[PDB]
Amino acid sequence: MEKVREIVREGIRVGNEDPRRIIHAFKVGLALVLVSSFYYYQPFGPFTDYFGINAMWAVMTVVVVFEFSVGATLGKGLNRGVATLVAGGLGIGAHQLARLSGATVEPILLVMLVFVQAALSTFVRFFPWVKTKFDYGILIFILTFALISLSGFRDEEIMDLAESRLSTVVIGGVSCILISIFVCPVWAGQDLHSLLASNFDTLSHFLQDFGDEYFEARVVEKRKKNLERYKSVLDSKSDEEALANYAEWEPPHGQFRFRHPWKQYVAVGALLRQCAYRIDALNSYINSDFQIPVDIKKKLETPLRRMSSESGNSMKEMSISLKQMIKSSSSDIHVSNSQAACKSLSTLLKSGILNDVEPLQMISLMTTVSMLIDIVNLTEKISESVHELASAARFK
Amino acid sequence: MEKVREIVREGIRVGNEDPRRIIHAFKVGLALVLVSSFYYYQPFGPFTDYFGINAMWAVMTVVVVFEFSVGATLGKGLNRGVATLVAGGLGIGAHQLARLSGATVEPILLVMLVFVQAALSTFVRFFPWVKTKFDYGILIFILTFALISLSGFRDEEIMDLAESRLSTVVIGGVSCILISIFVCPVWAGQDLHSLLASNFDTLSHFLQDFGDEYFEARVVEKRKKNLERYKSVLDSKSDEEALANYAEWEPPHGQFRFRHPWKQYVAVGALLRQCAYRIDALNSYINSDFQIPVDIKKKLETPLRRMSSESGNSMKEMSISLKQMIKSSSSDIHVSNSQAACKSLSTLLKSGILNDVEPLQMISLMTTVSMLIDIVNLTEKISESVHELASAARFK
């Protein structure tokens, strides 16, 4: 009973997390019905179905080449398609060779060829260039070759077997691709933009709410969760890569172009990760119980404040532009003011106001100043990268 | 020609990277031959092969359930096994129901059941609890149910079809598992230990060679590559998870136990990542062209040096123990001396020797002192975690 309730509760949590995870089941269902309706009503004239396995093969390929995205269906489909053709060709030919050899060695020779081919192909699987986008093609190549070359049938029906396998595969793939590109689609590149924009906004929110915590200007658990929310940015390496890879087979679905540079998206993601690198260091200083007396804080309050405010506005403005997919240069004035703020702080440091203080408490105050200066420089670099990701791609 | 040479050159690079990537192809080959030799010589009496697809199914399942590890074959095998049984059972039964209904609705009713079942199963696929280790079971469940319930055969041969499918699957899985656990095996947990030990050693090497660079005690590209080698530690999140998941199906292969706590391995990996977090910050200070005059460096040389030396020895000693799989407490004396070093530095800071210096160059020197103190504290925490990962598991 309690286990049943826990299972049910996860249902609403997953369903309400994303409304598109409950409409994809109906799509899988409509697939497995449309394909299984063509055969029964056998249109476009009659067929052969010599081995009586057309229905099984058509149904099977529709379940394994239908994935959540629309950039993981074309790719899987194209692999399952080509591989079979090539493997079949090489197969039907091989059977001719063994016939000439005779009637006793013929089975032994066939085994040797399939052994060598399987070993060579599965060694290629370990390469770092065919593993990112071609891990399925090699697997189907081994599968199709071994099935056709060692089916156990007679030599006067191998051509029909090869034709039947190819026909079922292409029929299933065509139906699966059409559905997922007509009735309520889900694109994969469009899930890389929003992810990048959310990362920008999350960092901005933390930066815009730093002066209150650091200067003690002020429930506690709720505010802690709001502050400590940068973990996502630091824990999204394995996901920004995949979605980028999955988004190279997409067609030009409207505004997005054929050659959209997703490589720059990963580069900008790394730069945002570097900003979050130092942010985690800064946050640990605040969380720590040890503290320095608040009185000193006012002495250098003015310079530190300016940095936090201008930094946050720059990030937020960029996420706004990157989202609406329109280029802008509003962040230039904000980063310029931040550079002016650092120069003013340096001029203030000439006066040496920070003298006559305890060196032990000085170490903590000094480290904070260090982190802020890097974030001002790091933001400047990120500004250049974004100012070009919106130029190589058409952001009109 | 040039493309051919590039392809060939990658061959030696991949082959010499790991000698075990060239012996796994022969294993795949021996598999696809042994299975295909049983049928031809039909031992243990004769069989039926009513539909003439036993050879195809046996060959097919051997190519898709053979993976590089030995913790990704049992798992895949067990899934492909159970799923079919359960799905078949539910299938043969469903056919009985439709018969009672009549002879016209019978096909329409069957389609409705398979539609509902497919939609429900593929929604479960999106859960975060059945995706880490059970993403294959659901897929085979949909596959087997849809094939049996919609094969298109007569009602007097469905039982034989279900029996044939189950028999081929179990035969292929048994052969594939036996090979990969008898002739030259490759374990997956054993590839998590060495990875953790290598991470420990890499961090130690950087820490043990910090005083020379920071104090200018001293080709350049070679030394830069030796220093800047911490990227691996920071870029191994997506791999320490997988290998851990793949290593829950392993049997007690000798010293390793049935319930080895790989969760603690991931926790120690996160702690090492936190040490590498701050290490990258420290390295960027060195790389930067801007510098502070070397003269001041000697003033506080003694405290900083001690920290680097003792820190490195502690890491190295641990990797030695963790590798030979024997517990030790040699790192206790090293971290204790580091704590003594920090107290001595604090006592030196009482005297305020660092006065009468330029505040602008002071910021850089001060930040370095900050980073070192955290690494001394962070190392202490890691010592506690390691001192228990070797206790929950049997490290005798």
Author numbering:
A (entry chain A), B (entry chain B): 1 to 218, 225 to 402
Paper quotes:
In plant cells, ALMTs are key plasma and vacuolar membrane-localized anion channels regulating plant responses to the environment. Among the different ion transporters and ion channels localized in the vacuolar membrane, the ion channels of the aluminum-activated malate transporter (ALMT) family play a key role for the transport of chloride and malate during stomata opening/closure. ALMTs are also involved in transporting various anion including chloride, nitrate, fumarate, tartrate, citrate, and malate. Here we report the cryo-EM structures of ALMT9 from Arabidopsis thaliana (AtALMT9), a malate-activated vacuolar anion channel, in plugged and unplugged lipid-bound states.
AtALMT1 shows aluminum-induced activation within minutes and mediates voltage-dependent malate efflux conferring aluminum tolerance. Addition of a detergent LMNG may have introduced artifacts in protein purification. Notably, the purification of GmALMT12/QUAC1 whose structure has fenestration employed LMNG for purification. To check whether lateral fenestrations are artifacts from our purification protocol, we determined the cryo-EM structure of AtALMT1 with the same purification method as with our AtALMT9. AtALMT1 of the clade 1 possesses no fenestration, and the conserved threonine residues apparently stabilize the selectivity filter. T61 directly interacts with R80; T84, T144, and W57 (W120 of AtALMT9) make a hydrophilic pocket for positioning of R165.
